[PDB]
Amino acid sequence: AAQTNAPWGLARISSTSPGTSTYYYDESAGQGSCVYVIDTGIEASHPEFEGRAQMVKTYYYSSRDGNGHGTHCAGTVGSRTYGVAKKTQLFGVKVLDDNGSGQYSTIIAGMDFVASDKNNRNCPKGVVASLSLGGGYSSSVNSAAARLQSSGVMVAVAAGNNNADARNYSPASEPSVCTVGASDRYDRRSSFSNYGSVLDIFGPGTDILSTWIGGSTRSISGTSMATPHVAGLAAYLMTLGKTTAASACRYIADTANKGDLSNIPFGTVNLLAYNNYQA
């Protein structure tokens, strides 16, 4: 399948080169997989989701995304225009209030929630979780990421927006999950991407067009926008049969486009997520 005049990041993770605007992908498009967006929620009523999104948890007084962040990230995963994995089932978990603030302990509660709940969902092709959030190093936050991953969920986490080595941030520094940095449409590491040997992979994160609340669409920027490209990609690769929840971060690195970003500080991977469909 081909989707012309696509947001640049969907074209990128289907291209070897920058500078084009069609998104090339096998039409399976994540059918039979499940992605949990653990964030401010998801405006499931957005027609871009076509009936495939359900809030399933909150730790606040409403499950609604009253911020828009969770809805944008979720759209990149799996909205019909703006998503990677255009036939995946999306499940929301509201661990952030509406300003974007979550206490750690609640973040943790969300995460163990997914390891349990996946068993209440129909996900024959595989489960993913997408965490576009974080704060300072915590062993506990990190440990809740290793549990979620160990429970057979592909876990994808934002490396962070401080232009700093990510080993000091959580859940990014955790080893066993898939820590995502960011790039721009000219293949520059994004000026705000954390870096450091804990990163596994980079994704489009600067001027990412996606859904917003009210039914609407905006472009914003962050390792948060990069993260759901890798989550959605992993859902896409499960469904096909290329990899598994426990093998997908390795698998994406193995198949990445290798050398191609500017400004990988020394010691940071220079691997860019790629679906290997067109070549």
Q: Which of 15, 28, 33, 39 does the annotation list as catalytic?
A: 39
Q: Give the length of the chain.
A: 279
Q: Is 165 annotated as a binding residue?
A: no
Would you say 2 and 24 are in contact if contact means Cβ atoms under 8 Å apart? yes
Q: Which of 63, 183, 190, 224 does the annotation list as catalytic?
A: 224
Q: Which is closer to Ca ion, CB of 213 or CB of 269?
A: 269
Q: Is 175 annotated as a binding residue?
A: yes
Told to judge if 26 belongs to the known catalytic residues of this protein, a careful annotator would answer: no
Q: Which is closer to Ca ion, CB of 218 or CB of 250?
A: 250
Q: Is 243 annotated as a binding residue?
A: no
Distance CA 100, CA 41 (A): 10
Distance CA 145, CA 133 (A): 12
Q: Is 141 annotated as a binding residue?
A: no
By the criterion CB under 5 A, which residues form the site for Ca ion? Answer: 200, 249
Structure tokens at 64: 């609604």
Q: Which is closer to Ca ion, CB of 85 or CB of 198?
A: 198
Q: Is 184 annotated as a binding residue?
A: no
Q: Which is closer to Ca ion, CB of 184 or CB of 200?
A: 200
Told to judge if 224 belongs to the known catalytic residues of this protein, a careful annotator would answer: yes
Nearest residue to Ca ion, by Cβ distance, number only: 249
Q: Which of 33, 63, 69, 130 does the annotation list as catalytic?
A: 69
Q: How far is the CB of 275 from Ca ion (least distance, A)?
A: 19
Q: Using the structure block, give the residue that is written with the tokens 């080169």.
A: 17
CA-based nearest residue to 118, from 149, 72, 84, 143: 149
Told to judge if 46 belongs to the known catalytic residues of this protein, a careful annotator would answer: no
Annotated binding-site ranges:
16, 175, 177, 200, 260
Annotated binding-site ranges for Ca(2+):
16, 175, 177, 200, 260
Query: Which residues are the active-site residues?
Result: 39, 69, 224
